[PDB]
Amino acid sequence: MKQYLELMQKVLDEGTQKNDRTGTGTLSIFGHQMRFNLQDGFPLVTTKRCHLRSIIHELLWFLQGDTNIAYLHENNVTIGDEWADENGDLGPVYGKQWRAWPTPDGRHIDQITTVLNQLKNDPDSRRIIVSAWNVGELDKMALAPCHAFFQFYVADGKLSCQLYQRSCDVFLGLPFNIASYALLVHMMAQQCDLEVGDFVWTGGDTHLYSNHMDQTHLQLSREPRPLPKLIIKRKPESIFDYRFEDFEIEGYDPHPGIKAPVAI
Amino acid sequence: MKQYLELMQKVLDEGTQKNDRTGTGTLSIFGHQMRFNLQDGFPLVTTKRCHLRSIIHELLWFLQGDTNIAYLHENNVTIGDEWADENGDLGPVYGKQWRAWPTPDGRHIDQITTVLNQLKNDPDSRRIIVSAWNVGELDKMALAPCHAFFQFYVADGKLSCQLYQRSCDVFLGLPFNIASYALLVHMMAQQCDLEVGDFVWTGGDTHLYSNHMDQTHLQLSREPRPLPKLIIKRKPESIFDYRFEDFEIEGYDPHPGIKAPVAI
Numbered sequence: 023m024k025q026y027l028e029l030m031q032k033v034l035d036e037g038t039q040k041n042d043r044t045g046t047g048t049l050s051i052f053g054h055q056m057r058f059n060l061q062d063g064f065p066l067v068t069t070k071r072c073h074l075r076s077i078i079h080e081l082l083w084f085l086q087g088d089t090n091i092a093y094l095h096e097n098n099v100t101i102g103d104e105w106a107d108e109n110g111d112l113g114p115v116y117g118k119q120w121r122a123w124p125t126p127d128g129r130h131i132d133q134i135t136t137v138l139n140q141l142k143n144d145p146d147s148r149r150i151i152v153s154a155w156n157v158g159e160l161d162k163m164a165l166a167p168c169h170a171f172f173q174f175y176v177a178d179g180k181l182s183c184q185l186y187q188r189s190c191d192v193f194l195g196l197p198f199n200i201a202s203y204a205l206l207v208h209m210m211a212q213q214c215d216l217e218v219g220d221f222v223w224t225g226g227d228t229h230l231y232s233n234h235m236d237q238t239h240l241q242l243s244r245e246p247r248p249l250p251k252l253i254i255k256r257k258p259e260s261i262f263d264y265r266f267e268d269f270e271i272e273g274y275d276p277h278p279g280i281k282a283p284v285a286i
Numbered sequence: 287m288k289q290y291l292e293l294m295q296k297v298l299d300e301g302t303q304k305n306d307r308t309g310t311g312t313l314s315i316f317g318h319q320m321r322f323n324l325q326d327g328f329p330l331v332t333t334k335r336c337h338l339r340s341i342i343h344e345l346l347w348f349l350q351g352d353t354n355i356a357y358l359h360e361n362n363v364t365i366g367d368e369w370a371d372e373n374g375d376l377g378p379v380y381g382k383q384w385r386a387w388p389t390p391d392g393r394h395i396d397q398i399t400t401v402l403n404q405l406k407n408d409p410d411s412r413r414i415i416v417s418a419w420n421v422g423e424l425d426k427m428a429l430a431p432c433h434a435f436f437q438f439y440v441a442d443g444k445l446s447c448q449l450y451q452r453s454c455d456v457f458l459g460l461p462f463n464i465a466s467y468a469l470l471v472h473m474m475a476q477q478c479d480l481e482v483g484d485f486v487w488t489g490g491d492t493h494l495y496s497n498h499m500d501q502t503h504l505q506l507s508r509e510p511r512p513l514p515k516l517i518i519k520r521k522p523e524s525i526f527d528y529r530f531e532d533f534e535i536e537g538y539d540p541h542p543g544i545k546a547p548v549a550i
């Protein structure tokens with residue numbers, strides 16, 4: 023899509039060569055923002071085929087507070103394979119912090135439920151937030167949260183959300199992330215009887231990997247196509263009852279997919 | 287400042303009537319981002335008389351992990367009197383989380399010192415972050431962190447930082463917050479022998495209080511003037527050893543000041 027392609031070109035134009043953890047090398051810019059009016063279509067990149075299926079499973083995996091790739095493998099999702107340990111454990115990452123942030127005094131904060139309640143009984147709150155950046159458990163996670171801080175907002179019956187992604191692999195990761203939260207907004211919006219608003223994406227270290235250049239140029243040479251439409255065949259009792267079969271994608275006519283090696 | 291006046295003007299045209307935890311009412315938008323290249327000058331609003339004293343004391347206060355308004359009240363800084371308790375306590379706010387974020391297992395993380403080391407030994411890191419949004423303590427705090435999460439970044443010998451402010455009172459707080467972080471950047475920079483880069487400001491609920499409309503139109507009629515230059519007269523041996531008398535501002539020729547009420 024346009025915002026995405028423009029972000030690619032932006033990095034290409036004013037990015038700086040920078041070494042990195044993986045040792046792969048990147049071209050990066052710091053700080054960026056784009057918006058997607060969910061009412062214009064589900065934001066699923068078209069300049070290359072994307073498997074919305076793997077995205078759904080990763081999200082449902084979070085909403086259950088699970089952090090062992092076992093469930094993912096149960097559905098053929100290999101996105102955690104290069105970092106999980108022998109027991110398929112990544113650590114107290116996304117899921118654990120989302121449903122059960124451990125307080126030093128014994129409590130466990132279920133943030134998703136907190137936000138839900140706020141959206142229903144206090145949509146005006148400016149503190150409707152979910153954070154995966156729990157400093158106290160960083161060292162235990164197999165990898166630091168990329169999408170680490172998001173906020174919800176409601177106005178004129180529309181639900182919006184902005185994500186803060188401290189680190190972002192524009193070519194391989196961004197498309198997953200955008201679709202992820204966009205998806206979460208629909209679900210929340212459905213449970214809270216609200217319409218979908220905008221999904222504001224904000225980034226920190228927005229980079230393009232040295233070995234993703236050729237593919238980026240290939241995608242950037244393709245013309246974006248109409249955005250598809252998210253279809254939820256059923257309204258579950260809670261935001262914790264969605265299953266992969268409840269989601270449907272219509273009108274998605276993406277360009278051929280493009281493979282690229284991930285930096286471990 | 288141009289960017290600030292553009293944001294202020296945007297809230298007017300596109301803003302939406304909302305209601306806040308303070309029966310004051312507001313006109314807000316959700317999600318915005320501005321960029322301040324510190325190389326062009328210290329970002330201290332000029333279309334309104336301001337001063338660093340309070341901002342300086344607060345930051346030094348934060349850097350010490352202090353959360354009691356004694357230091358502030360001492361030098362006559364009232365910014366936090368309307369919310370502290372009979373003992374001057376605000377609870378575990380900003381400074382507490384910055385210098386001693388409590389893990390779930392009896393330990394405390396000094397995020398500042400951590401970042402200090404990350405910039406000196408691992409500048410390419412995409413995990414140099416500081417958060418005050420400790421979910422397990424949000425209910426022990428007198429007030430929820432507005433400037434709740436920020437990140438650092440290095441490139442070509444220049445330190446840059448981005449702040450995620452989930453709640454922002456455009457007329458009153460923004461000018462304070464902006465110059466506050468800018469200052470921290472210059473401080474971190476000196477402490478690491480780096481030069482200052484960009485201060486990226488990102489906001490969630492960006493509102494304009496309904497009882498600030500008059501002073502907003504007044505400020506909008508003024509022409510921004512050249513930004514001033516910051517001078518740190520001494521180089522402490524620690525980012526925690528700075529003294530109020532270390533800061534100077536040269537070339538600040540602002541328009542008259544504008545008084546406004548604080549939504550409690």
Ligand SMILES: C#CCN(Cc1ccc2[nH]c(N)nc(=O)c2c1)c1ccc(C(=O)N[C@@H](CCC(=O)O)C(=O)O)cc1
Pocket residue numbers: 044100101102191194195196198199280281282283284285286
């Ligand atoms: C984001 C996210 C979730 N994750 C988590 C995750 C973990 C580490 C990461 N590390 C790096 N350097 N890039 C990422 O974006 C990244 C993302 C993913 C991880 C890998 C792939 C991946 O390589 N997909 C390939 C191959 C697809 C396939 O197997 O069919 C692709 O071409 O998309 C996708 C998602």
Ligand SMILES: C#CCN(Cc1ccc2[nH]c(N)nc(=O)c2c1)c1ccc(C(=O)N[C@@H](CCC(=O)O)C(=O)O)cc1
Pocket residue numbers: 336364365366455458459460462463543544545546547548549550
């Ligand atoms: C941010 C921050 C710290 N704080 C914290 C703080 C707490 C609650 C808030 N509440 C609201 N509605 N907006 C804010 O910006 C805000 C700021 C401050 C609190 C008050 C003032 C204040 O009343 N300033 C006046 C007078 C300043 C002067 O003496 O020149 C002003 O109009 O500037 C400034 C900062």
Ligand SMILES: *c1cc(=O)[nH]c(=O)n1[C@H]1C[C@H](O)[C@@H](COP(=O)(O)O)O1
Pocket residue numbers: 043044165166168169189190191192194195196199285412413
């Ligand atoms: C992390 C996973 C995700 O949800 N999205 C991504 O974009 N990323 C990328 C960022 C970076 O290239 C890598 C994480 O590495 P690091 O922790 O920033 O060193 O995956």
Ligand SMILES: *c1cc(=O)[nH]c(=O)n1[C@H]1C[C@H](O)[C@@H](COP(=O)(O)O)O1
Pocket residue numbers: 148149306307430431432433453454455456458459460463
């Ligand atoms: C909080 C303090 C700060 O450092 N900067 C500010 O702009 N804010 C403002 C935001 C909001 O108008 C008010 C706090 O409101 P709430 O806690 O989000 O309801 O202070």
